[PDB]
Each structure stands twice: as C-alpha cells, then as structure tokens.
C-alpha cells in the first residue's frame, strides 16, 4: 500500500499520524477500503462541485439545492466567504487523493455531494426534503448543525423531518436504512447540553463529538448521553486543526469545531460500508460501540457500564477506529429486528421541588414480542413543568448501575416552558440487560426555591433478545 502523495496529507495529522493519536485510517486503506461505491451527502450551505479536489468524486445524484429549489448545490459566493462550510466538510469525507492538490478525504474514492439547505430559511419542509434526498442512492448523510447552540434552546425535528428520519432508516438504502451522521454541537462555551438538540439526541442519528490533538475536551464540546463516539478536531492555538478543501478552489488548515468531526466520522462509516454493504443503520451503531477507543482521551467522567465498556458524556465510547471498524464489519452478523418496550412509569404526578427520585423495577416486556434482554438506545420521555428549566439536572440509572446524565444544568436556560414529552436518550447502557430497577433523578442545582411537577415519565427501551457478547 502506498500512502497518499498529496501536498497537505502530512498536515492531516488525524489521518497521517505515526504517534497513535489518529483515526487509524491508513490501516483501513491498506486493507483495500477507500470508499469505492459509497455515496455521501453533506447537508450544509452548498458544495463547490468544481473544486479541483472534489470534482473527480462529485456526484450530482447526491446533491440538491433546497434553498433555491434546483439540482445545483453550488454555494453563494460572498465577500465574507460565508457559504464555505459544506465544501470544507465534503473534502473531509472525499477529497481526491494522489492528485497534487490539498490533502485527501477519509474515503477518497467515495462519491460526494451536498444539499444546499442552510443558506435560507430552514423550515421543517426544507429539513425533510434534505434528509430524504435520493434515499436509494445516497448511503450516508452528514449534518454538522442543528438548533441554535446558545445553551437555552430545546428543539428538534418537527413532523416532516421526523417522518424523514423514520422513512430513511426504514425504507432507505434498500431497506437497510439511511445512515445519518450528526455533530453533537458547538455550544460548550454556553454550557449547552446536547440532549436538548433533538437531531443529535435521536436514535436515528449516529452522533459524534470532538477531541483536541492533545486528547482533551475542546472548549466548544457539549456533553450528553446521546453521543456515540468521537473524532479529532480543533482545540487551542498550539493544537492543529482540520485540513481540507475550501471555497474558491483553495485549501484550508483551519477547519474547526464539532461540525468538522461529523464529516470525518461519515468518511469512516463510508469505509466501513464498503467493507460490508449489507450493514443496517443499527449494525453501524453497534460497530461504533464495539470498536471505538477511549485510550488517551482525557475526561473526568469515564465510567465503566454494565458490559464493561468505558463511556463518557464528552466522547461516547471513544475515538473512532477505522481499521477496527472495517475489520469487524466484514463478517458482521446482522442484528435481530429492533424491539421497542414502552413502560409508563408514574402512577401519579410528582412534585419536583428541590429534588425528586423515581424508582421503578421493570421486566422489559417479559413474555412479549418486544421483550428486550439486550439494550440499544434507552429514552426517558419526560413531561414536566418547572419555573427555570436550566436549573434542572436529570440523571437516569440503569439496573446495571450505569448513571446517564440526561440533562446537565444550563445556566442560560431561563425558560419556564419545561419539557413536553422530551425523549432524553442515552447510549451508555448499550448491550445491558434492562430488566430490574431504573432510577430517575431530577435535581434543582440552584439555591433558588424553584418549583414544578413531573407529570409523565415513559421509559422506552430499544433492543433485541439475542446475540450478546461476553462483557469486555
Ligand atoms: C414547528 C416547526 O415547523 N419547526 C421547524 C424548526 C426548523 C428549525 N429546526 C432546527 C434547525 C435549525 C437550523 C438553522 N440554524 C439554527 C440557528 N442558527 C443558524 C440556523 C438548521 C437545522 C438543520 C441543520 C442541518 Cl445541517 C440539517 C438539518 Cl435536517 C437541520 C435545524 C427545528 C424545527
Ligand atoms: C443481508 O442481510 C440479510 C439479513 O441477515 C440477509 O437475509 C441477506 O441475505 C443479506 N444479503 C447479502 C447480499 O449478504
Ligand atoms: Ca442552485
Ligand atoms: Ca487531493
Ligand atoms: Ca447544542
Ligand atoms: Cl419508534
Ligand atoms: Na449544533
Ligand atoms: Na443520535
Ligand atoms: Na459501572
Ligand atoms: Na436486571
């Protein structure tokens, strides 16, 4: 195997590293996996389809302009180069290799397109038409953005967009399911908590956070239990950043944020799908859980879950490992059909006051076709009133003792609107047996005399009842 000769490939430290602080992509390339036959679409502000490092892989069938309602996602050029982000993300996935231009994509033989959707008013309809673009041609969708990362917003897909997620994972990709890769957010400096973003908090999105070059949690990172894994991105000014294609046929060394992590993950997922085109959308999440690596990622919240895997709210299961992903994909056995066990927990509304604990012992649909002994995602769907939402912190503890933070205190969130059946999701109990006692904790983290009521708590378990591995 000959590594790429591109002039900035040596600067792509998160791929070309020899120091074990990389995504282990060369190992996948050397196994023969470069993305051939896979199609990825960037949902963003457009794609410079004539960029010298993108044209050779550009796919019009992976592209659309839902802002102007035409097929051509070319960005709108402005003095400030506002609409450059999709082009940066596209190059991360699939910049051409060995062509003397810039660097290379993770999946440098994949086909790449873009949906121009962010350069205009983003409505539910715009979102749905983007998520649902050509779902039997595009394999993987990469989205780096969501509701405002101001640390006070709670929002997610409205009805059309939610329908697009369920149509995508159910009928997309020949019934195997569209793979939606999502950035978990850039709201760290606002103390944002990413389960309040219903796109990344979705079970249908494979959610990705960031680590700095030196292995730290970047200033912009949001912690939450819905995140699955991590890719490298930017950090402080002594740490390197992402090197990729830029607007106006240029090359940037200063692509940043969690919004630069999701495209790298999408590229690794493209390599993985080349290794096994029969992987379902759930299979892909299983592979990520099993192969991601905590080593050398620094966080104070690494915890071992009930099946022996280390998990963090900053990093999920750790750094994506492309070589391990493609290796495990090859002989992967398709997971069983997804079961869903719905448990209405409360017998009466509960005053929250300063602190509320709700304990319930469940059988996880014992005796029914939705019996789950092997959890995937778990949700606590909560309806509650409270006078100042961001003073709340919420935790969910599984029968195996795994404490998922569903919501951290958000100091900017002054809302009096509470949560209306908000489906806080955790990945941290993946593969655990969910039978037994679950504990929900809601706490007022402020000294204020805050008040409200929990009126509904639905525990929703997803998973199967077969195929478990020995704990790690
Ligand atoms: C009731 C009803 O109709 N509500 C419609 C709402 C429409 C907006 N949306 C959240 C949202 C917003 C925005 C716009 N940003 C937020 C604030 N800053 C800059 C602009 C973008 C997304 C979004 C981004 C990507 Cl890359 C893919 C998808 Cl699929 C989406 C998502 C929530 C629902
Ligand atoms: C894909 O997986 C399904 C489910 O296990 C199986 O029935 C089918 O034969 C597989 N197809 C290929 C081409 O491997
Ligand atoms: Ca256009
Ligand atoms: Ca190149
Ligand atoms: Ca956020
Ligand atoms: Cl469902
Ligand atoms: Na975001
Ligand atoms: Na997700
Ligand atoms: Na534990
Ligand atoms: Na149990």
The span from the CA of 66 to the CA of 51, in Å, is: 21
Domain definitions of the chain by residue range: 6-330, 333-464
| Resolution to 1 decimal place, in Å | 1.6
Establish whether 119 is a catalytic residue: no
Note the ligand closest to the C-alpha atom of 311: 9
- 470 Cβ contact list (under 8 Å, min separation 6): none
**CB 228 less than 6 A from any atom of ligand 1:** no
The annotation status of 83 as a binding-site residue, yes or no, is yes
Burial of 297-325, coded b for 16+ CB within 10 Å and e otherwise, reads bebeeeeebbbebbbbbbbbbbbbbbbbb
Task: Please count the other Cβ atoms lying within 10 Å of the Cβ belonging to residue 252.
Answer: 19
The span from the CA of 329 to the CA of 112, in Å, is: 22
Establish whether 44 is a catalytic residue: yes
| Residues pairing with 384 in the sheet | 419, 454
- 310 Cβ contact list (under 8 Å, min separation 6): 294, 302, 303, 304, 317, 318
- The values of phi and psi at residue 346, to 5°, are -80, 140
The span from the CA of 410 to the CA of 151, in Å, is: 6
The annotation status of 380 as a binding-site residue, yes or no, is no
The span from the CA of 53 to the CA of 94, in Å, is: 9
Q: Are strands 303-304 and 310-311 parallel, antiparallel or unpaired?
A: antiparallel
- Name the nearest CA neighbour of 339 among 368, 360, 382, 381: 368
CB 176 within 8 Å of CB 38? no
- Name the nearest CA neighbour of 247 among 405, 98, 411, 45: 45
The annotation status of 16 as a binding-site residue, yes or no, is no
**In the CATH hierarchy, which top-level class contains the domain 333-464?**
mainly beta
What are the CA-CA distances from residue 211 to residues 85, 123, 144, 192, 316 (Å)? 20, 31, 16, 17, 11
Q: From ligand 9's centre to the CA of 466, what distance in Å?
A: 22
Active-site residue (options: 22, 44, 59, 321): 44
Q: Whose CA is nearest to atom 1 of ligand 1?
A: 158
Sign of the torsion angle spanned by Cα atoms 421, 425, 431, 433: negative
Q: Whose CA is nearest to atom 12 of ligand 2?
A: 278
Q: Whose CA is nearest to atom 14 of ligand 2?
A: 278
Q: From ligand 10's centre to the CA of 345, what distance in Å?
A: 17
Task: Kindly tell me the burial class for residue 465, based on how many C-beta atoms sit within 10 Å of its own C-beta (0-12, 13-18, 19 or more).
Answer: middle
The minimum-distance atom of ligand 2 relative to the CA of 278 is 1
- The values of phi and psi at residue 35, to 5°, are 100, 5
Establish whether 446 is a catalytic residue: no
Q: What is the CATH number of domain 6-330?
A: 3.40.50.200
Active-site residue (options: 41, 51, 63, 85): 85
Q: From ligand 8's centre to the CA of 225, what distance in Å?
A: 10
């Amino acid at each position: 195997y000959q590594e790429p000769t591109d002039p900035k490939f040596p600067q792509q430290w998160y791929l070309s590293g020899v120091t074990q602080r990389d995504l282990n992509v060369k190992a996948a390339w050397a196994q023969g996996y470069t993305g051939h036959g896979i199609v990825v679409s960037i949902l963003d502000d457009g794609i410079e389809k004539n960029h010298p490092d993108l044209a050779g892989n550009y796919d019009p069938g992976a592209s659309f302009d839902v802002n102007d309602q035409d097929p051509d996602p070319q960005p709108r050029y402005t003095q400030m180069n506002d609409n450059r982000h999709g082009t940066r993300c596209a190059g991360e996935v699939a910049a051409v290799a060995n062509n003397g231009v810039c660097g290379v994509g993770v999946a440098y033989n994949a086909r790449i397109g873009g949906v121009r959707m962010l350069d205009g008013e983003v409505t539910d309809a715009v979102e749905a038409r983007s998520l649902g673009l050509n779902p039997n041609h595009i394999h993987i969708y990469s989205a780096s953005w969501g509701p405002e990362d101001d640390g006070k917003t709670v929002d997610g897909p409205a009805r059309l967009a939610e329908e697009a997620f369920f149509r995508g994972v159910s009928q997309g990709r020949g019934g195997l399911g569209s793979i939606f890769v999502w950035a978990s957010g850039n709201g760290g400096r606002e103390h944002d908590s990413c389960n309040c973003d219903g796109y990344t908090n979705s079970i249908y999105t494979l959610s990705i956070s960031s680590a700095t070059q030196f292995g730290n949690v970047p200033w912009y990172s949001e912690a939450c239990s819905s995140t699955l894994a991590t890719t490298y991105s930017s950090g402080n000014q002594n740490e390197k950043q992402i090197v990729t294609t830029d607007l106006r046929q240029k090359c940037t060394e200063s692509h940043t944020g969690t919004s630069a992590s999701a495209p790298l993950a999408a590229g690794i997922i493209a390599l993985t799908l080349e290794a096994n085109k029969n992987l379902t959308w759930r299979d892909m999440q299983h592979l990520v859980v099993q192969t991601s690596k905590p080593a050398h990622l620094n966080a104070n919240d690494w915890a071992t879950n009930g099946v022996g895997r280390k998990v963090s709210h900053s990093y999920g299961y750790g750094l994506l490992d492309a070589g391990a992903m493609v290796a495990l994909a090859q002989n992967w056995t398709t997971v069983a059909p997804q079961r869903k066990c719905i448990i209405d927990i409360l017998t009466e509304p509960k005053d929250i006051g300063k602190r509320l604990e709700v304990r319930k012992t469940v059988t996880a649909c014992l005796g029914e076709p939705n019996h789950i002994t092997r959890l995937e995602h778990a949700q606590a769907r909560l309806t509650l009133s409270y006078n100042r939402r961001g003073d709340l912190a919420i935790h969910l503890v599984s029968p195996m003792g795994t404490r998922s933070t569903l919501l951290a205190a958000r100091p900017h969130d002054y809302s009096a609107d509470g949560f209306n059946d908000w489906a806080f999701m955790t990945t941290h109990s993946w593969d655990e047996d969910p039978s037994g006692e679950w504990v929900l904790e809601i706490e007022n983290t402020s000294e204020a005399n805050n008040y409200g009521t929990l009126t509904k708590f639905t525990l929703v378990l997803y998973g199967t009842a077969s195929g478990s591995l020995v704990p790690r």
